[PDB]
With several copies, the nearest count.
Chain A
Amino acid sequence: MVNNINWVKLPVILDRLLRHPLLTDLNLETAIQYTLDFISAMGLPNVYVDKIETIDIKEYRGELPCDLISINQVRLHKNGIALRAMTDNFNAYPTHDHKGEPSFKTQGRVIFTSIKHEKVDISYKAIMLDDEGLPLIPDNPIFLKTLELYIKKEWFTILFDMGKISPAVLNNTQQEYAFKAGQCNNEFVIPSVSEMEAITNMWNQLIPRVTEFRRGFKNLGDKEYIRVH
């Protein structure tokens, strides 16, 4: 992302929506759901906050944090060795012989690892919250314009099923959302001048680096210097 993600509270989005006299019965309760339906559908990873937490595995099981949404990487606390993913169908289940590589698996508020008794560090992503327990949205007026249009798109769809909006008004709102929801995708994704140096070092390599996942993706963007002979 090129810009910085400054945080503003949710009543900024109702400065803009209630400028339209057809959307004046929007509420904070209606704006809380339509913001979270939007943030998840757009899926821009720069909207979430990066958190690191150490949890302890009891018996191939650990208790996962409350505010988690998605895990970037799990590692081991003693080695720093990262864990990949459990492809095993038969993880902690022993044969009657009562009988290699760390891996993990996450479903709910539980993590299923291939290690028995060890501490693991989990680098995850959460929603950034307010003083209130509400989501805190970015300041970028491409994001705020396309969030304004999304809430306007789902409200006008409800009026069109009732029959209180002509079909050319929804068809224009579905069109104007469709461009700004792509323009918001291109804004939050396209790398910076600082972030294109981290891709210039990864892409240009005389001797290829194919084990960055074993580290914490730390040297993914590091310059591969070559001695002169």
Chain B
Amino acid sequence: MTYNELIYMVLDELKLSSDDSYYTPDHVIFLLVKYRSFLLKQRYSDIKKQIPDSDYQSICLDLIEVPAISGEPCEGSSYLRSKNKVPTTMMIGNPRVYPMDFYQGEITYISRDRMRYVGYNKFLRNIIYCSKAPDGYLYFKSWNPQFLHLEKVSFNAIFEDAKEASEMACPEENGTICKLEDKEFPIEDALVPPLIELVVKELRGPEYSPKDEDNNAKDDLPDAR
């Protein structure tokens, strides 16, 4: 299913059908994406299970050769990094950087805390390591100088923001999708009715709360206006 069906079954269950309503679809797109990450972390962090194929998003990345700090010679070897910032993956799935083919290539996405001591084994010196820096870009690393010829990679993980990874989405075979609401929502259908009920209960209470309607240079909420 798409974003459009999930927005408009939260809205049509709340009956926010009027154009002049206080809670827009932009309230829901925020509250669906945050309650998705809340719902995935409560099911899949207690013990390890299978994540289905549906909670994941594949984003395409373009890499550029960047130095360690600047153009100085005694500062270290250079890296690769994505041109754009990368969404923060959740730590409950199988993140995977693959060279636009899922069933091929060994590019290993690791933690940022491990990557500063990596590749020192002699049988691990041709492997391309990944992590998302504090800057927000996915950095690439090897002891092999062949790795600096990568131009395009993809990235399949459980990202925190469903909205962030929908904008960096891989281009389809027909073409790129213009609207956000026409892209597939990354959650299993077995979690959609717990997801709808939480967002609706979040916004059913505030839906009938009084508004500061009077323009009197005065707070009118203590009088239930």
Q: Give residues in A with beta carbon < 8 Å to B.
A: 8-9, 11-12, 14-15, 18-19, 21-22, 24-25, 27-29, 32-33, 36, 132-135, 159, 162-166
Given A24-B113, A25-B94, A28-B106: A15 and B121 interface contact (C-beta under 8 Å):
yes
- Residue of B111, B114, B123 near A133 (CB, 8 A) is B123
Q: How many angstroms between the C-alpha atoms of A18 and B93 in the bound complex?
A: 14
On whether the beta carbons of B124 and A29 are closer than 8 Å, the reply is yes
A167 to chain B, nearest CB (A): 12
The interface bits of chain B over 36-51 (1 if a CB of A lies within 8 angstroms of the residue's CB, else 0) are 0000000000111110
B121 to chain A, nearest CB (A): 6
On whether the beta carbons of A163 and B47 are closer than 8 Å, the reply is yes
The size bracket of the interface on B is: 20 to 34
8 A-B pairs with least C-beta separation: A11-B117, A14-B117, A18-B114, A164-B48, A25-B94, A24-B113, A29-B108, A12-B120
On whether the beta carbons of B48 and A15 are closer than 8 Å, the reply is no
On whether the beta carbons of B123 and A135 are closer than 8 Å, the reply is yes
Q: Give residues in B with beta carbon < 8 Å to A.
A: 46-50, 91, 93-94, 106, 108, 111, 113-114, 117-124, 126-127
Residue among B93, B94, B117, B120 with the highest chain A CB neighbour number at 10 A = B117
Q: How many angstroms between the C-alpha atoms of A72 and B121 in the bound complex?
A: 25
Q: How many angstroms between the C-alpha atoms of A132 and B50 in the bound complex?
A: 32
B159 to chain A, nearest CB (A): 16
Number of A-B contacts (CB under 8 A): 67
On whether the beta carbons of B111 and A164 are closer than 8 Å, the reply is no
Q: How many angstroms between the C-alpha atoms of A12 and B143 in the bound complex?
A: 14
A160 to chain B, nearest CB (A): 10
Q: How many angstroms between the C-alpha atoms of A1 and B117 in the bound complex?
A: 29
Given A27-B108, A165-B47: A32 and B124 interface contact (C-beta under 8 Å):
yes
Which residue from chain A places its CB closest to the CB of B126 in the assembled complex? A133
Q: How many angstroms between the C-alpha atoms of A23 and B93 in the bound complex?
A: 11
Q: How many angstroms between the C-alpha atoms of A195 and B87 in the bound complex?
A: 58
Q: How many angstroms between the C-alpha atoms of A166 and B49 in the bound complex?
A: 12
- Residue of B94, B108, B118 near A24 (CB, 8 A) is B94
- Residue of B46, B49, B93, B117 near A15 (CB, 8 A) is B117
Given A8-B121, A164-B48, 19 new contacts (CB under 8 A): A8-B120, A12-B117, A15-B114, A15-B117, A15-B119, A15-B120, A18-B113, A18-B114, A21-B111, A22-B48, A24-B94, A27-B106, A28-B127, A29-B124, A133-B126, A134-B123, A163-B47, A164-B46, A165-B47
A220 to chain B, nearest CB (A): 34
On whether the beta carbons of A164 and B123 are closer than 8 Å, the reply is no
- Chain A residues within 8 Å of B120, by CB: 8-9, 11-12, 15
- Chain B residues within 8 Å of A14, by CB: 114, 117
- Chain B residues within 8 Å of A27, by CB: 106, 108
User: Can you list 10 pairs linking A and B with CB atoms under 8 Å apart?
Assistant: A12-B121, A14-B117, A15-B117, A22-B50, A24-B114, A27-B106, A28-B127, A29-B106, A29-B127, A165-B47
